[PDB]
């Protein structure tokens, strides 16, 4: 299973790698600590990485659109930013519910302006992952994929 790196890291010893983000590694060692003996897939050389910098490459941690420890302020703050349109999306696990999840998405109305709403995604115990009743996914990925296409109760379309 490959890793990919979340970010670009600049090396800081003589032992560490250098990469960019999107790059592929293979893991060596990850016994020793934070910093994992990996080999680059661009590259070929060998090296230690931060382990807080990578993610398996089908991860949910890896998708673009997933902000994991990213609290509700900040998901705001964030989607807040200038550029990002109406529709602008991220998930990142839920503030209130272990277990649970947020769908953050940047909106527009006539007495807010430019606001975030939040929908709470939930988990059936013999079930999938849901925002109604509607519809359930075994993955978040395609509840991503779902909403992508059509709205279906939600504020607006999911704009991947
Ligand atoms: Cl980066
Ligand atoms: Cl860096
Ligand atoms: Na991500």
Same mark, same amino acid.
């Given at each position: 299973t490959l890793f990919v790196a979340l970010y670009d890291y600049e090396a800081r010893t003589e032992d560490d790698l250098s990469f960019h983000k999107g790059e592929k590694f293979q893991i060596l060692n990850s016994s020793e600590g934070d910093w994992w003996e990996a080999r680059s897939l661009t590259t070929g050389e060998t090296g230690y990485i931060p382990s807080n910098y990578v993610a398996p490459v089908?991860?949910?941690?890896? +998708? +673009?659109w997933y902000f994991g420890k990213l609290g509700r302020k900040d998901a705001e703050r964030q989607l807040l930013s200038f550029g990002n349109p109406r529709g602008t999306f991220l998930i990142r696990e839920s503030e209130t519910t272990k277990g649970a999840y947020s769908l953050s998405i940047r909106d527009w109305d006539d007495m807010k302006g430019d606001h975030v709403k939040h929908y709470k995604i939930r988990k059936l115990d013999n079930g999938g992952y849901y925002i109604t009743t509607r519809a359930q996914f075994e993955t978040l990925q395609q509840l991503v994929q779902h909403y992508s296409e059509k709205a279906d109760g939600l504020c607006f379309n999911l704009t991947v």
């Amino acid at each position: 299973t490959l890793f990919v790196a979340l970010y670009d890291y600049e090396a800081r010893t003589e032992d560490d790698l250098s990469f960019h983000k999107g790059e592929k590694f293979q893991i060596l060692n990850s016994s020793e600590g934070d910093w994992w003996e990996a080999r680059s897939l661009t590259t070929g050389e060998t090296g230690y990485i931060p382990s807080n910098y990578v993610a398996p490459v089908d991860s949910i941690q890896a +998708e +673009e659109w997933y902000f994991g420890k990213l609290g509700r302020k900040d998901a705001e703050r964030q989607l807040l930013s200038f550029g990002n349109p109406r529709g602008t999306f991220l998930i990142r696990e839920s503030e209130t519910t272990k277990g649970a999840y947020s769908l953050s998405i940047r909106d527009w109305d006539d007495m807010k302006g430019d606001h975030v709403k939040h929908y709470k995604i939930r988990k059936l115990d013999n079930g999938g992952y849901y925002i109604t009743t509607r519809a359930q996914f075994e993955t978040l990925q395609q509840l991503v994929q779902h909403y992508s296409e059509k709205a279906d109760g939600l504020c607006f379309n999911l704009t991947v």
